[PDB]
């Protein structure tokens, strides 16, 4: 009638043109003409094309290596089924359900999916094909450029959003990070606090633009959020934020940087504690499986308070080393509880070391271990001091969990009351060696050891003060060596109280030897052992007396 029912007729001729193209021997002029004309006709009836006809057309074009043309049709169809951009406003309004723009967005999404298939089949068809042959570009390369041209030449905004999402999906950080546009940044800023993977992209854009503080802000908020993020992923986020806030970002005050770097440092300290707990609890043989699943639920997520970590987990499982790390992170002012925790950690470790040495002695004698016991483990005082070192390096000795005035006497007490001395082949001064190497200043050691010797608290009583004197001798000796070394150092404090202390020490030894000579059952065997200590103490009082007397102010002078 009204010639020639144009929309429904053109769509048929276009299918006829495309069918003849695929029936060809691929002689370029005829194949290009049929393809080019088929695309010409389909575009004229873009707004009317049904999803079934569009799919079959694209697939036929894909089969004939007409990638750019297929993409161009899909974009044209998308723009024609929605010339008012009802889809762009429906996305810009949060995609409210119950709305009738969903239809307009879906008709575009069918076109965008088909564009994914074109590009997918493109990289597949040319998998292994070189981009250059003999110097100039191949045919397979020019079709890749021609296709991706059509993509970057578009002004469809819902399309470019759908392509950012698609690049993210496929993992092509290659091509997305390489976009100058802010349009992609702005698109990420709205969904950054919605998904981890999107936030990570946003932070990459910030960092490469030297906007480190803004990335540290995104990462920190993401770690404090209630999104489904694992604890370890929250450790990475905080660790990155801590680094990014520690460096200058232009336009932002030093105060604002430090306050964020400090919040990220504290939360990272708590997170590591929580991770150490969760790992240990899951691996613990003495924990029932039923409970472990419950622990994994409450600890492999957002970071918990230090109270909960202590009460509900660290204290229940007697992980006293992590209790001490918790008292450090919390600035916990309570000397008595701290020392109670130190006492439990020492005793727990001693019993565990004794148990492992027993199992060993059974292997070396032929016996059988208890069922389910994995078969020369360190002496108990060695494993104990390993525990003290691991904590000290993690807390740095500046903590309130290292009050040397209380902790050194306790460790010395353990050594006496458990025979961790010469009987088993240990250095009797091992407690002093430990705290010196850890970096306790020499003056503070002698100061404590003096208080141990004056107050005579058990076990430091009677003739066991012989051992206290030996510790003082060893500490002062190292102190003297340190002063002599520091004097030679500066060529290229000690008071009279140290001298008095060595005099009293000599008196204690004279008293112990006398008491030892009149003991019931026979004289003491340590006669010459004490005579040796007397000589050492006198030698140290001599050295200290020379330093105090002027030789310390003349250490940088040539002799």
Angstrom distance (rounded) from CA 201 to CA 129? 30
Measured from the CB of residue 251, what is the shortest distance to Na ion in angstroms?
7
Both tokens of 372, joined, read: 């389910």
Angstrom distance (rounded) from CA 159 to CA 107? 12
Contact characters 157-196, Na ion, x per CB under 5 A? ----------------------------------------
Both tokens of 179, joined, read: 């976009």
Size of the residue set binding Na ion (CB under 5 A): 2
Please, are residues 540 and 480 in contact by the beta-carbon 8 Å criterion?
yes
Q: For Na ion, which is the closer residue by CB, 252 or 404?
A: 252
Q: For Na ion, which is the closer residue by CB, 252 or 555?
A: 252
Measured from the CB of residue 166, what is the shortest distance to Na ion in angstroms?
37
- Find, among 165, 157, 242, the residue nearest to 197 by Cα: 165
Measured from the CB of residue 253, what is the shortest distance to Na ion in angstroms?
6
Contact characters 10-49, Na ion, x per CB under 5 A? ----------------------------------------
Measured from the CB of residue 113, what is the shortest distance to Na ion in angstroms?
46
Angstrom distance (rounded) from CA 261 to CA 245? 5
DSSP alpha helices (H): ranges in 225-372? 231-245, 254-283, 289-299, 306-308, 320-329, 335-363
Element (H, E) at 132: strand 132-133
Q: For Na ion, which is the closer residue by CB, 250 or 283?
A: 250
Q: What SS3 class is residue 179?
A: coil
Both tokens of 306, joined, read: 């230090």
Q: For Na ion, which is the closer residue by CB, 112 or 213?
A: 213
Tokens 């002004």 — which residue? 155
Q: For Na ion, which is the closer residue by CB, 261 or 470?
A: 261
Measured from the CB of residue 201, what is the shortest distance to Na ion in angstroms?
24
Q: For Na ion, which is the closer residue by CB, 220 or 420?
A: 220
Q: Which of residues 212-271 bind Na ion (CB under 5 A)?
A: 248, 252
Measured from the CB of residue 243, what is the shortest distance to Na ion in angstroms?
15
Angstrom distance (rounded) from CA 218 to CA 197? 12
Measured from the CB of residue 217, what is the shortest distance to Na ion in angstroms?
14
Q: What SS3 class is residue 136?
A: strand
Please, are residues 468 and 453 in contact by the beta-carbon 8 Å criterion?
yes
Measured from the CB of residue 211, what is the shortest distance to Na ion in angstroms?
11
Q: For Na ion, which is the closer residue by CB, 252 or 548?
A: 252
Both tokens of 283, joined, read: 């691996």
- Find, among 291, 294, 234, the residue nearest to 264 by Cα: 234
List of residues 6+ apart from 156 with CB closer than 8 A = 75, 78, 79, 108
Q: For Na ion, which is the closer residue by CB, 252 or 330?
A: 252
Strand-pair partners of 262 = none
Q: For Na ion, which is the closer residue by CB, 19 or 210?
A: 210
Q: For Na ion, which is the closer residue by CB, 213 or 471?
A: 213
Angstrom distance (rounded) from CA 540 to CA 528? 19
- Find, among 286, 281, 373, 384, the residue nearest to 342 by Cα: 384
Taking the alpha carbons of 476, 478, 480, 483 in that order, is the dihedral positive or negative?
negative
Q: For Na ion, which is the closer residue by CB, 149 or 258?
A: 258
Angstrom distance (rounded) from CA 16 to CA 56? 12
Measured from the CB of residue 260, what is the shortest distance to Na ion in angstroms?
12
DSSP tag of 45: T
Q: With binding defined as CB under 5 A, does residue 555 bind Na ion?
A: no
Measured from the CB of residue 254, what is the shortest distance to Na ion in angstroms?
6
Measured from the CB of residue 454, what is the shortest distance to Na ion in angstroms?
55
Angstrom distance (rounded) from CA 12 to CA 26? 22
DSSP tag of 366: T
**Where along the sequence are the contacts to Na ion (CB under 5 A)?**
248, 252
């Amino acid at each position: 009638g009204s010639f020639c029912s144009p929309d429904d007729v053109v769509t048929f001729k276009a299918q006829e043109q495309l069918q003849r193209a695929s029936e060809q021997a691929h002689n370029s002029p005829v194949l290009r003409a049929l393809l080019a004309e088929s695309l010409r006709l389909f575009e004229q009836v873009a707004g009317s094309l049904t999803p079934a006809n569009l799919t079959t057309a694209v697939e036929q074009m894909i089969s004939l290596k007409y990638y750019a043309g297929a993409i161009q049709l899909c974009l044209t169809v998308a723009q024609q089924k929605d010339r008012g951009n009802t889809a762009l406003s429906w996305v810009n309004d949060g995609k409210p359900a119950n709305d009738s723009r969903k239809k307009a967005f879906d008709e575009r999404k069918i076109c965008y999916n088909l564009i994914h298939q074109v590009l997918d089949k493109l990289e597949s068809d040319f998998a292994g094909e070189p981009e250059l042959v003999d110097g100039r570009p191949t045919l397979a390369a020019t079709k890749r450029m021609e296709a991706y041209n059509v993509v970057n030449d578009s002004s469809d905004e819902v399309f470019h959003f759908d392509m950012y999402e698609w690049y993210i999906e496929k993992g092509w950080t290659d091509r997305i990070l390489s976009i100058d546009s802010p349009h992609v940044i702005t698109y990420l800023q709205r969904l950054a606090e919605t998904d981890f993977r999107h936030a990570e992209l946003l932070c990459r854009f910030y960092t490469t633009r030297s906007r480190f503080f803004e990335a540290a802000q995104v990462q920190t908020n993401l770690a404090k959020s209630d999104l489904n993020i694992s604890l370890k992923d929250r450790i990475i986020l905080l660790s990155r934020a801590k680094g990014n806030a520690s460096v200058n970002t232009i336009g932002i005050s030093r105060q604002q940087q430090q306050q964020l770097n400090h919040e990220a440092s504290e939360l990272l300290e708590i997170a590591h504690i929580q991770d150490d707990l969760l790992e240990r609890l899951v691996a613990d043989p003495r924990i029932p499986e039923e409970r472990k699943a419950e622990i994994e639920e409450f600890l492999d997520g957002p970071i918990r308070t230090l109270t909960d970590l202590f009460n509900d987990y660290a204290d229940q499982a007697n992980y006293y080393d992590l209790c001490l790390l918790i008292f450090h992170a919390a600035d916990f002012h309570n000397p008595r509880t701290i020392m109670d925790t130190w006492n439990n950690l020492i005793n727990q470790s001693h019993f565990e070391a004794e148990q492992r040495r027993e199992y060993w002695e059974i292997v070396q004698a032929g016996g059988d271990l208890p069922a389910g016991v994995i078969a020369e483990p360190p002496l108990p005082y060695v494993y104990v001091s390993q525990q003290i070192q691991l904590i000290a390096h993690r807390t740095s000795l500046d903590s309130l969990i290292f009050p040397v005035n209380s902790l050194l006497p306790v460790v010395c007490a353990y050594a006496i009351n458990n025979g961790q001395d010469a009987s088993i082949g240990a250095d009797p001064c091992w407690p002093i060696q430990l705290f010196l190497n850890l970096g306790v200043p020499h003056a503070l050691m002698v100061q404590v050891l003096e208080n141990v010797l004056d107050t005579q608290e058990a076990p430091f009583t009677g003739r066991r003060r012989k051992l206290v004197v030996q510790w003082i001798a060893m500490a002062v000796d190292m102190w003297v060596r340190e002063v002599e070394r520091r004097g030679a150092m500066a060529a290229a404090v000690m008071g009279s109280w140290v001298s008095e202390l060595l005099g009293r020490a000599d008196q204690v030894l004279t008293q112990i030897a006398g008491t030892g000579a009149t003991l019931r059952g026979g004289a003491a065997s340590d006669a010459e052992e004490i005579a040796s200590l007397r000589r050492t103490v006198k030698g140290l009082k001599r050295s200290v007396d020379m330093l105090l007397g002027g030789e310390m102010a003349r250490m940088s002078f040539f002799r």
